[PDB]
Amino acid sequence: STAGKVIKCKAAVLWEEKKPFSIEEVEVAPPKAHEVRIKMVATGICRSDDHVVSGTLVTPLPVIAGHEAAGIVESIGEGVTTVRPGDKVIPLWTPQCGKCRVCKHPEGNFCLKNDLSMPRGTMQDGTSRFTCRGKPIHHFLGTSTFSQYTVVDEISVAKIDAASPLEKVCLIGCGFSTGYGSAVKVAKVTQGSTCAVFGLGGVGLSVIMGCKAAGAARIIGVDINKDKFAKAKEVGATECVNPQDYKKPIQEVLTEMSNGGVDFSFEVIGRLDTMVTALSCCQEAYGVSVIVGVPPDSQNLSMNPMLLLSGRTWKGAIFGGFKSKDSVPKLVADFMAKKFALDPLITHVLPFEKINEGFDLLRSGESIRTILTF
Amino acid sequence: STAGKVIKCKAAVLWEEKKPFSIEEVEVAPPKAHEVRIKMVATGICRSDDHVVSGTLVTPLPVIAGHEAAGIVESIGEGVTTVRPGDKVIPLWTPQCGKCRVCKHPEGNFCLKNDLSMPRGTMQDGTSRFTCRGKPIHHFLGTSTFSQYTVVDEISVAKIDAASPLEKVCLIGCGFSTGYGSAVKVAKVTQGSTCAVFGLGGVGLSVIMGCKAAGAARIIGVDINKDKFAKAKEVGATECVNPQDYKKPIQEVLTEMSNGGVDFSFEVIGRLDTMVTALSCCQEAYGVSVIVGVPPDSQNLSMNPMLLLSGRTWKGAIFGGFKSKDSVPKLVADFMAKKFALDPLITHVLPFEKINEGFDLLRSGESIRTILTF
Numbered sequence: 250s251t252a253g254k255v256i257k258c259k260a261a262v263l264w265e266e267k268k269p270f271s272i273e274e275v276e277v278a279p280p281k282a283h284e285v286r287i288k289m290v291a292t293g294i295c296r297s298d299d300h301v302v303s304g305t306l307v308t309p310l311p312v313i314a315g316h317e318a319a320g321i322v323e324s325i326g327e328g329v330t331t332v333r334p335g336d337k338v339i340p341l342w343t344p345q346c347g348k349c350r351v352c353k354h355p356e357g358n359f360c361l362k363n364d365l366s367m368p369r370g371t372m373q374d375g376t377s378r379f380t381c382r383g384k385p386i387h388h389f390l391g392t393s394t395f396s397q398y399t400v401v402d403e404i405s406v407a408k409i410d411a412a413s414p415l416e417k418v419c420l421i422g423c424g425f426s427t428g429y430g431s432a433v434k435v436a437k438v439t440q441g442s443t444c445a446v447f448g449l450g451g452v453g454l455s456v457i458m459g460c461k462a463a464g465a466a467r468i469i470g471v472d473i474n475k476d477k478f479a480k481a482k483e484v485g486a487t488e489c490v491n492p493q494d495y496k497k498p499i500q501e502v503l504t505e506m507s508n509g510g511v512d513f514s515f516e517v518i519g520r521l522d523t524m525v526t527a528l529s530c531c532q533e534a535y536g537v538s539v540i541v542g543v544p545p546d547s548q549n550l551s552m553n554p555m556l557l558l559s560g561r562t563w564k565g566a567i568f569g570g571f572k573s574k575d576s577v578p579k580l581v582a583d584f585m586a587k588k589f590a591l592d593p594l595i596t597h598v599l600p601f602e603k604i605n606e607g608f609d610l611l612r613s614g615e616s617i618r619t620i621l622t623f
Numbered sequence: 624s625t626a627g628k629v630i631k632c633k634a635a636v637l638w639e640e641k642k643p644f645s646i647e648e649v650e651v652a653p654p655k656a657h658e659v660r661i662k663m664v665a666t667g668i669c670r671s672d673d674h675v676v677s678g679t680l681v682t683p684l685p686v687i688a689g690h691e692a693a694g695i696v697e698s699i700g701e702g703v704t705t706v707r708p709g710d711k712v713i714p715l716w717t718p719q720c721g722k723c724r725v726c727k728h729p730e731g732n733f734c735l736k737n738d739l740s741m742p743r744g745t746m747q748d749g750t751s752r753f754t755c756r757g758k759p760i761h762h763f764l765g766t767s768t769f770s771q772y773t774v775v776d777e778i779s780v781a782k783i784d785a786a787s788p789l790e791k792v793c794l795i796g797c798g799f800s801t802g803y804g805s806a807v808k809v810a811k812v813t814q815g816s817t818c819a820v821f822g823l824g825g826v827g828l829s830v831i832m833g834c835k836a837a838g839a840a841r842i843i844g845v846d847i848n849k850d851k852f853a854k855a856k857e858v859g860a861t862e863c864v865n866p867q868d869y870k871k872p873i874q875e876v877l878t879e880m881s882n883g884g885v886d887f888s889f890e891v892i893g894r895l896d897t898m899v900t901a902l903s904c905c906q907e908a909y910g911v912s913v914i915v916g917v918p919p920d921s922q923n924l925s926m927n928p929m930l931l932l933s934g935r936t937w938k939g940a941i942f943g944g945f946k947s948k949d950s951v952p953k954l955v956a957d958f959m960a961k962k963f964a965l966d967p968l969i970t971h972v973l974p975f976e977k978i979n980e981g982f983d984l985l986r987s988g989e990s991i992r993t994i995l996t997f
């Protein structure tokens with residue numbers, strides 16, 4: 250009964266930095282040309298959503314955040330052809346326009362139509378579909394999933410298996426895919442190798458899954474919260490180390506353990522020091538280090554370039570290097586085919602109304618992923 | 624006549640930093656077990672040898688530098704099996720012991736027996752085979768080619784084509800292979816790509832040859848010495864730019880020229896700033912940047928890791944990524960087969976006695992490579 254009409258629904262609005270989310274009534278406009286309105290069913294709480302709160306990730310406010318989710322299309326705008334009302338879909342915070350230089354590149358995935366590099370907080374047309382208390386509200390990465398209904402550009406949505414469990418596959422919208430791809434696609438982990446994974450949250454655990462799927466023989470988790478070790482080992486870690494427990498730099502500990510350095514290392518936290526530690530801990534002649542974590546805004550790191558001259562490779566990636574629209578449905582099909590697991594990542598399931606409690610669990614280190622159900 | 628006997632011959636000894644080399648009479652001991660004494664025929668002047676003089680590269684003094692050379696085996700020590708007296712050889716300043724974890728890796732080449740990371744200035748056994756005026760003199764990178772005769776460990780020498788032109792193939796000992804490999808092996812340049820090469824000396828020009836051999840469609844040379852542009856174009860550069868010509872930083876110029884960044888960039892100079900510039904000038908989502916240049920001893924650079932998070936790859940290599948003993952003979956064979964050219968890199972040929980003049984030519988910007996003949 251909503252097609253072609255404004256919808257009034259509940260959403261979590263962040264009015265300013267460093268404040269809790271405010272559950273409010275918002276008004277969601279119907280979709281314009283090449284836009285899709287989606288009924289959200291489940292959304293995950295990613296550390297990147299917290300970065301918005303903390304100021305680590307600068308984006309226009311007030312905003313409706315959220316970028317890891319899954320739902321059902323409610324209606325479509327003029328000219329849409331990739332989805333229809335009723336389809337199961339996952340919003341793509343990294344779009345895939347299919348026409349830019351990156352999209353046409355065989356490897357690149359950071360589409361030039363993204364709203365991450367210089368955020369505008371809007372739809373591709375430069376406007377907003379949301380109003381709250383008479384005020385237009387900004388969008389987030391073109392997705393804004395912390396709302397019962399959202400509107401997204403066609404290039405930022407993927408159709409998925411009609412049989413998918415939305416409360417699980419929302420993870421494929423961000424956390425899982427990012428981590429998993431960082432291992433199998435960006436780093437290209439090899440059979441029998443030794444890997445080090447710094448950070449054992451939702452993304453890091455997905456990195457471990459990817460290292461295991463690639464055939465790694467040894468996987469070392471690194472985290473200051475030891476309650477994360479058990480889960481890290483269940484998904485593939487052979488060993489875990491806690492930097493707080495040691496008298497010397499963890500890079501020396503990891504280098505000794507691995508008889509001279511690891512094959513592949515991953516920074517999945519978001520700290521300058523751990524980015525350099527991760528690079529240093531890989532074998533100097535052939536090691537590969539991938540940065541996944543997001544540091545805070547603007548601050549530069551200092552490092553010795555001879556760490557690279559010796560032969561190391563250092564790189565980073567968005568969304569695990571996956572071309573979004575092409576990949577998401579394939580990942581869901583692999584999940585349905587039982588090629589990987591998502592349950593281990595989920596520690597909590599809460600109603601959407603408890604979003605702030607979900608963020609509390611993240612900050613306190615008591616959760617991996619909290620899935621919010623609408 | 625000389626086997627098993629001390630040889631008295633001329634060599635260039637560097638007694639102190641920032642001094643001219645001193646032509647001296649030195650005593651060269653016969654080879655000990657698993658060592659090989661070689662009569663040098665030709666040696667090139669590489670910027671790395673100048674780094675020893677300038678203090679850019681710290682290594683024990685006094686020393687006999689030189690590492691880009693070709694010669695003929697004069698005698699061998701007990702147990703040697705890979706070369707015989709009379710064989711044409713090229714000394715290897717990166718060894719290949721064949722036994723360490725790097726030598727056994729399919730890609731890595733920075734053998735753990737190198738004398739580059741933590742230089743001792745000696746043979747593998749920790750002693751020296753050179754005496755001058757009764758004082759022991761240090762070796763350099765296990766090669767010490769600035770002497771009529773040198774002694775090298777077996778893992779630091781490769782036999783080559785008996786008909787090879789030693790005054791040309793010496794370049795394969797360093798400059799050419801480093802640049803060529805950095806493009807074809809380390810960067811893995813792709814057909815139709817756009818490359819940027821920072822530094823148009825012997826190594827940078829070799830990088831251009833590798834980019835051309837890889838099929839690059841566009842190659843932009845960057846040097847503050849415009850006198851190098853004609854040769855750069857001769858070997859494959861489509862364009863050349865001089866940063867001194869511009870008010871804008873060179874990365875902005877390069878990014879604009881390449882419609883958003885190059886595919887592959889190479890720093891072949893040895894400056895911290897240029898390393899970051901080169902990285903920044905490659906495409907943000909899929910660009911690759913390789914560091915080849917050597918900066919002053921132990922100095923760190925400052926950079927924003929968001930440069931990598933977007934998807935850039937940053938790496939470095941020693942000797943073009945080539946496993947030394949395995950590759951050098953193959954490279955010589957390729958040269959003999961006309962698969963690449965070495966002449967365009969040689970601007971001057973001088974007697975060894977004029978070593979200082981050759982270093983002067985390098986520092987003034989008049990030469991690409993000077994070859995010293997004994």
Ligand SMILES: NC(=O)C1=CN([C@@H]2O[C@H](COP(=O)(O)OP(=O)(O)OC[C@H]3O[C@@H](n4cnc5c(N)ncnc54)[C@H](O)[C@@H]3O)[C@@H](O)[C@H]2O)C=CC1
Pocket residue numbers: 295296297300423424427447448449450451452453471472473474477492517518519520523540541542543544566567568569611614617932
């Ligand atoms: N590159 C991409 O495309 C994306 C990047 N990210 C970023 O990846 C990072 C991780 O994301 P989540 O897993 O959601 O975060 P999380 O907060 O769930 O996990 C972070 C882990 O790092 C641990 N940690 C914190 N400080 C540490 C330290 N000094 N030393 C060792 N361990 C430490 C924490 O105890 C925690 O377990 C975040 O920065 C996020 O913004 C998130 C997904 C996509």
Ligand SMILES: NC(=O)C1=CN([C@@H]2O[C@H](COP(=O)(O)OP(=O)(O)OC[C@H]3O[C@@H](n4cnc5c(N)ncnc54)[C@H](O)[C@@H]3O)[C@@H](O)[C@H]2O)C=CC1
Pocket residue numbers: 558668669670671674797798801821822823824825826827845846847848851866891892893894897914915916917918940941942943985988991
């Ligand atoms: N990674 C490895 O295995 C090896 C590293 N190297 C290093 O490669 C570098 C190049 O070696 P060569 O070709 O022999 O040196 P070179 O002195 O012949 O050439 C260097 C070029 O850089 C230019 N240049 C200087 N400052 C510049 C600036 N701000 N901007 C743009 N261009 C500038 C110079 O005019 C010159 O043409 C040296 O640092 C050397 O030590 C040398 C070979 C092996």
Ligand SMILES: O=CNC1CCCCC1
Pocket residue numbers: 295297298306316342365423543567568
């Ligand atoms: O978490 C999802 N997206 C992230 C990607 C890295 C920059 C912060 C936003």
Ligand SMILES: O=CNC1CCCCC1
Pocket residue numbers: 669671672680690716739797917941942
């Ligand atoms: O130039 C020859 N060898 C180089 C290798 C890189 C550090 C300086 C010495």
Ligand SMILES: [Zn+2]
Pocket residue numbers: 295296297298316317423424
């Ligand atoms: Zn996320």
Ligand SMILES: [Zn+2]
Pocket residue numbers: 344345346347348349350351352360361362
């Ligand atoms: Zn695109």
Ligand SMILES: [Zn+2]
Pocket residue numbers: 669670671672690691797798
């Ligand atoms: Zn050299």
Ligand SMILES: [Zn+2]
Pocket residue numbers: 718719720721722723724725726734735736
């Ligand atoms: Zn070795």
